[PDB]
Amino acid sequence: DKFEKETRGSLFGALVHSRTNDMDIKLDMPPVPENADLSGLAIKVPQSI
Amino acid sequence: DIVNLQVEMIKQFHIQSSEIQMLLERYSLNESLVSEIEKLREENKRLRANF
Amino acid sequence: AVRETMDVLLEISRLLNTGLDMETLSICVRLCEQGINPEALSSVIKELRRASDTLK
Amino acid sequence: NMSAVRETMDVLLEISRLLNTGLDMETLSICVRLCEQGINPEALSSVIKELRRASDTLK
Amino acid sequence: MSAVRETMDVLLEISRLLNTGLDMETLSICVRLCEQGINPEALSSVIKELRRASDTLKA
Amino acid sequence: PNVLLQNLCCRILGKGEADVAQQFQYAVRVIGSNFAPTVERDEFLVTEKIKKEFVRQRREADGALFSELHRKLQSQGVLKNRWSILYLLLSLSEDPRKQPNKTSSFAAL
C-alpha cells in the first residue's frame, strides 16, 4: 500500500514538486531564482536527512 | 554662567543628533527585512510549481 | 617665538598646580596668532580636561 | 454670590486702568481664575505678555 | 556600619530644619551618589524636576 | 551608579519599578550634560550660605542649632563629600511663609 500511494501520488515519479493524487494538476517547474540574474546557476543538489 | 550654558548647549546637540540619525537609518534600510522578502519570493516560485 | 613663550607659560602652570604638558602650550600659541576666540579656546581645554578625568 | 464676583471685578478694574493696559475686563477676569487654578506668577506673566505680542503683530 | 547609623541621625536634623522633604531611604541614595562622585548642580536639578513631575502625575 | 539612580526614580514617585523609565532615562540625559559649578569645595563657604539663609527666612534659632549640628557631624565621621551634600540641602531650602500656588491643579493644563 505504501508503494501504491507513493507511486500514485508522485504520478509515476513525473512530479518532483510535491505528491498529490490529482490528475488535473498542471506540470510546472519553479520560475528562475532571484539571484540567478547575478550569480548564474549551477546544478541543484538534493539531500537525505 | 554663560560659558557653562554654552558648552552644555552644543553637547546636547551632538548627542541628540546621533540618536535621531541612528533611528532614521534603521527604518530606512534594514538588511534583516530585505532578506525575508527574498526568502518569501523563493517560496512563491516553489508554490507555483506545486500547483 | 614658540619655545620661549612655552617656557614662560609652563612655569606659570606649574605655580597654579595645573596639569598641562609642553604639547598644549605650543599648539595654543599657533591658534592664538591665526585667530582663535580666547573664550572658545579656553572652553575647549576645560572640557577636554573634564573628559580625561571622567574616562580615567 | 453674584455681587461678590462683581465687587471683586470692580476693585481690580480700577487698579488696572491706573497702571494702564489695553486689556478689557473679560481677559483680566480669566487671569484671576488662572491664578486661582494655581500656577507660578512667571508662567502666567509670560503667556499674557506673549498674547499681547502676538496681537499687535497680527493687526 | 556602626558609623553609617550615627551620621544619619545628625544629617536628618539639618534636612528637616532647612526644609528639604526627603525621607530616610532617599536621603541614603544621595549620600551614595555624592560618594561615587556626582556634579552637585545635576543632583539638585534632578531632585527639583522629579518632585515637580511627581505631584502633577499623582493629581 | 545605575542601580542607585534608578532606586531614586522609584522612591520619589513612590510607585513604579519600570513605570519610572521615562524619569530614569531623563535623569541619565541630564547627568550626561556636563554642568560646571560656581565654587567647588571649602567647608566654610557652603556652611556660611546656610547660616545667612537661616537668618533670612526668620528661623534664627534653628540657624543657631545648625552650627552645633555641623560640628557634631564632623565628629560622628569625617566627610569628603560634604560640599555636595550641604549644597543639595541648600538648593532644596524653602521659606516658612507662603505656598507655591497650586501644583495639584496645574496637572489639568
Instruction: Name the residue among E51, E25, E29, E48 with its Cα closest to residue F85.
Output: E29
In this complex, whether C and B touch, counting 3 or more CB pairs under 8 angstroms, is yes
Any idea what the Cα angle at residue E27 is, between residues E24 and E31, rounded to 5°?
Answer: 140
Instruction: Name the residue among E27, B22, E46 with its Cα closest to residue F28.
Output: E46
Question: F44 burial class (0-12, 13-18, 19+ CB within 10 angstroms)?
Answer: exposed
Sort out which chain B residues have CB atoms less than 8 A from F38's CB and list them: 1
Question: F87 burial class (0-12, 13-18, 19+ CB within 10 angstroms)?
Answer: buried
In this complex, whether B and F touch, counting 3 or more CB pairs under 8 angstroms, is yes
| Inter-chain touch C39–B7, beta carbons under 8 Å | no
Query: In this structure, are residues F103 and E56 in contact, taking their beta carbons and an 8 Å threshold?
Result: yes
Q: Which three cell numbers stand for residue E36?
A: 561615587
Which one of F76, F80, F105 would you mutate to disrupt binding with E, by most E Cβ within 10 Å of its Cβ?
F76
Q: How far apart are the first and last CA of chain D?
A: 38
* CA A12 to each of CA A3, A8, A24, B46, D31: distance values in angstroms, whole numbers, following the listed order: 11, 6, 15, 21, 92
- Cα–Cα dist F6/E46, whole Å: 12
Touching D (3+ Cβ pairs <8 A), the chains are F
Q: Touching check for C37 and chain B: CB below 8 Å?
A: no
Q: Touching check for C43 and chain B: CB below 8 Å?
A: yes
In this complex, whether D and E touch, counting 3 or more CB pairs under 8 angstroms, is no
Q: How far apart are the first and last CA of chain F?
A: 35
Which residues are CB-neighbours of F5 under 8 A, at least 6 positions away?
A: E33, F24, F27, F28, F31
Resolution of the coordinates in A? 4.6
Query: In this structure, are residues D31 and D44 in contact, taking their beta carbons and an 8 Å threshold?
Result: yes
DSSP D1-59: -HHHHHHHHHHHHHHHHHH--S--HHHHHHHHHHHHT---HHHHHHHHHHHHHHHHHH-
- Cα–Cα dist E23/C52, whole Å: 36
**E 1-59 near F (Cβ less than 8 A):** 3, 6-7, 10-11, 13-15, 17-23, 25-26, 29-36, 38-59
| Inter-chain touch B51–A29, beta carbons under 8 Å | no
Q: What is the DSSP letter of A29?
A: P
- Quote the minimal CA–CA distance from F96 to chain D in Å: 18
Touching C (3+ Cβ pairs <8 A), the chains are B, F
Q: Which residues of F touch B (CB under 8 A)?
A: 29, 32-36, 38
Q: Touching check for F34 and chain C: CB below 8 Å?
A: yes
